Structure 1
């Protein structure tokens, strides 16, 4: 039995119009949901597959997530009980009602695990919808943003492409990174402690890997005092090159600069701080210096674990960044501890500093000062 025999594949124009992942997208009156039900073993065809659709308004009871729940209840009565792995590709993330219904269903049934790939985040800026996605995640649903691979898979399985291959729309990768970072913020995703310790150790770097992790937070000026702005706190990393994502990669500092306009900050004074495992290369620093030159109400503070020699003009880039008003400093014990406490999935464990932390911070601080004073 093949997916083509299980579903009526949707029209290609229905798929592309409904699954376009522009984060802010008006005019869509419908939610689409493609799903597969599998055993514990993921290889081969699913046990069954279905496409559900429902109008957003006026009744959530006809949203495709609830249509799925009613179909799946009846389907299970007709098949021999076993453990099920369910995958959804949904055009909009769940509204508050569906999120709470699915969360209740998952939490009462240890035999079912659910992964939800979403094309767009629905009302991601509204606290009610944020809290509902957290309840769904806490019920064990794995919630991810649809990337190129999932759009292509959904095209192959659920669309009447007539053998033509999936063609990505404009800016699919840029949309993905904005949504991924936004989903991480609202789920309050914390960084793996091993990933933190490995990447923020400031001893001389000996690994062949060049990856950059970047933790960020935002403050607002209020009554001559900086106050936390808890909505936009999290971490991200560089995007490795891939011809279906960013063909030349996208460095962490640039992904961070992409986020700031997406936050829709008002005209008040803001201080945006990042803790990055590598200081920015020349290209990143130029872009960062351009940004702060053009956004006078945003103050940048950059704390770096290590100084990245890009074999080019990185020293001049750091000088330009400082000249244009960014604060640049090397992370000391206090900044390492703050990120462990704030951004890392530490499970109550205190910060344990690696060997030579203080000594390496002093050496790097002296190198930075020498760079900035030329």
Structure 2
């Protein structure tokens, strides 16, 4: 159920440029659903598969759970790659049909942020009740704590690794800010 600590470090790695050994930074999504009646959170994670994308895999998962439409839920997502233009649309739709869910999205990296469609896509999310932010130490902290297996001994220092995501996320944050006001 739990991501391996090496999967976390490699896949959430928001570095400017990769360090050797090189590896594909795959899409990955960490969601957590909290009811607002004072209740227990539910968690899981998705990759890209079949005819999906992790966001689309997660939209249909919610539908499966058959939630309580009389209840507001807080839905938080942690994406290594900020969403598609196409997934942007499919998410804006989804949230419009499910007003009883409060969606918030955090990206570790901004996917093709120099292209207009991905730009418009993110401005839309932020215009259509779906705030988009860059993960910072708070979000990197919560994702490590609750989504990563901590039973085995690590080949690296977790606190320094988190330190470095925090540091790298700053320039990624100013870039997202500039996109919103364009």
Q: Tell me, yes or no, whether TM beats 0.5.
A: yes
Give aligned pairs, total.
173
The correspondence for 2:33, drawn from 214, 218, 221, is 218
Per-residue deviation, residues 11-41 of structure 1 (Å, max 9, x unmatched): xxxxxxxxxxxxxxxxxxxxxxxxxxxxxxx
**2:82 aligned with 1:279:** yes
Per-residue deviation, residues 303-348 of structure 1 (Å, max 9, x unmatched): 1111101756101000111101112111111211111110000228
Q: Matches of residues 121-140 of structure 1 in structure 2 within 5 Å?
A: none
Q: Matches of residues 1-374 of structure 1 in structure 2 within 5 Å?
A: 189-206=1-18, 209-222=24-37, 227-230=38-41, 232-239=42-49, 246=50, 249-267=51-69, 268-309=71-112, 311=115, 313-347=117-151, 351-354=158-161, 356-374=164-182
Unaligned 5+ runs, structure 1: 1-188, 240-245
Higher relative contact order (CA 8 A, sep 6+): 2
Quote the RMSD (CA, aligned, Å).
Answer: 2.0
SS in 1 for 2:36: strand
**Bigger-Rg structure (1/2):** 1
Question: Following TM superposition, by how much is the alpha carbon of 1:229 offset from its aligned partner in structure 2, in angstroms?
Answer: 3.3
SS in 2 for 1:313: helix
Question: Following TM superposition, by how much is the alpha carbon of 1:359 offset from its aligned partner in structure 2, in angstroms?
Answer: 2.5
Q: TM-score, normalization: structure 1? A: 0.44
Q: Distance in 1 between matches of 2:116 and 2:60?
A: 24
Per-residue deviation, residues 148-189 of structure 1 (Å, max 9, x unmatched): xxxxxxxxxxxxxxxxxxxxxxxxxxxxxxxxxxxxxxxxx1
Per-residue deviation, residues 234-273 of structure 1 (Å, max 9, x unmatched): 111111xxxxxx3xx4211111111111111112111111
Q: Distance in 1 between matches of 2:34 and 2:43?
A: 10
